[PDB]
Structure formats: structure tokens, C-alpha cells
Amino acid sequence: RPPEETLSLWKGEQARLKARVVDRDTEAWQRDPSFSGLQKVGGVDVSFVKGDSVRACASLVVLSYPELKVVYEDSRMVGLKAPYVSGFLAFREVPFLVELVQRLQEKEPDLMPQVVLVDGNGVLHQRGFGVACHLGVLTELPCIGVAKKLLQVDGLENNALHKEKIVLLQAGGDTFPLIGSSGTVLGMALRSHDHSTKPLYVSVGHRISLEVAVRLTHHCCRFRIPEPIRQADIRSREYIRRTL
Ligand SMILES: [Mn+2]
Ligand SMILES: [Mn+2]
């Protein structure tokens, strides 16, 4: 676990970049009732090795929309430089994802995604600047944060009341808002699939509104996990498994 000097630097870096986050729609396809004009959706993930604190595999996929077929994949082995500390996930993962986006620009610039689904939160975060905001600000791409568990910040808890609301979600697309103690909506719990009970936690990363982000996340869900994140997850784990 890092020294305080490193944590301060990281908090200071998060506060500096937070000023560049845009939490409204800035792309024409976002204001369209069926997202007409959206053709390419990105997904990123990093997989790790059970006995290894140094090596990891980072993946970027691009999928066509709305067919959700993989049209681009880049999976590469990387050397970790920071351990996992909750609230500082970007400093473990985002440097490698930025490089993957730069590599896409050099190899297949016409397949640059119009929005990236990130495994982890955006503005639903201890300091309002999670890994999905961090990636968005560093690449300037629109980003959505999709987390598989609830980050307990600003009075949010996975308590008895919270689980009552999860029971109330009955079908894919059903949602309920995640309200901070300041009264502000930090994200949405989303039941992504008809045949899944555990919701997703969706928040704004960059250059997108929450309502658009929730609706797009739902439209990418063949299973519980949205297909761009699901394919990056499957492919980066396969790469590690085959070289292990
Ligand atoms: Mn991940
Ligand atoms: Mn994963």
C-alpha cells in the first residue's frame, strides 16, 4: 500500500483533472431517440494473474452498434506500477488503456469508438472522479462507468433498504436512482437483463448524460455485463490463461 505522499499526489491529480469533466451530452447521436449515428462502442478491461503483482493484460475492443459484433481487438501484456487502492483505480489501470487508445489511432483510426464503456465507476466516486472520468478526460472520448458492485460513498450503502429496491426491479431496463446525502443523483442501479437479478451501477464518465448512459448500457446487454466490457474481460482473461 502506497505512502501518504503518493496518495496526496493522486488526490491532487484527481482534483485537477475533474475540472475538465463534461457531464452533459455533446454528440449528436446522444440526443437521438434511437442513437442514430452511433456505429462503434468501445469496451476496456484489465485482467490479472493469481500469483503475480507485476503482470497484467489490458484489452480494448470496439463493437459495431447495434449488432454488437467485435470489429477490433487489442490485448497486450503490461507491467503494473501501482497496487489496487479503492478510489485510486485509475492509477493502476488508466495509463495502459490510454496507450491502447493511442495504438488504435495508429492502426485503425477509422474504428475509433464513439463512446467507451469502462469497468468501474465514473462520477460515483469518493472524490467525484473515478476511473471512467479519468479515462474520458485523458482521451477526450465519451465514457460510461459501469460497476458490478456498489461503491459506498456519500451515504450510499448496500443495506436492507437498498436491497429492497433491487427486489423491485422486475425486468431489463428497470432502474432506481443512487442519491447522495447532498440530494444529488450520482448514478443509476440498472437491471440489465430479464434473467439477471444483480443490477449494474451506471454513472457518467465524460461527455454524456446519465439518462443517455443508462439507456445505452441497457442496449449493449446480451447478458448481465454489457457486451463491450464483457468481450474485453473474456479476451484479456483468455490471453493470460493461455500464457500461464
Ligand atoms: Mn476491470
Ligand atoms: Mn474483468
UniProtKB/Swiss-Prot annotation:
Highest levels detected in liver with high levels also found in heart, kidney and testis. Expressed at low levels in brain. GO terms for cellular component: cytoplasm; cytoplasmic stress granule; nucleolus. Its cofactor is Mg(2+). The record marks 84 as: Interaction with target DNA. GO terms for biological process: DNA repair. Signal peptide: none annotated. It is found in: Cytoplasm; Nucleus, Nucleolus; Cytoplasm, Stress granule. Disulfide bonds: none annotated. The keyword Chloroplast does not apply. It is an enzyme of class 3 (hydrolase). Its main location: cytoplasm. Keywords: Cytoplasm, DNA-binding, Endonuclease, Hydrolase, Magnesium, Metal-binding, Nuclease, Nucleus, RNA-binding. Endoribonuclease that specifically cleaves inosine-containing RNAs: cleaves RNA at the second phosphodiester bond 3' to inosine. Active against both single-stranded and double-stranded RNAs. Has strong preference for single-stranded RNAs (ssRNAs) toward double-stranded RNAs (dsRNAs). Cleaves mRNAs and tRNAs containing inosine. Also able to cleave structure-specific dsRNA substrates containing the specific sites 5'-IIUI-3' and 5'-UIUU-3'. This is Endonuclease V. The gene is Endov. The chain holds residues 8 to 251 of 338 of the full protein.
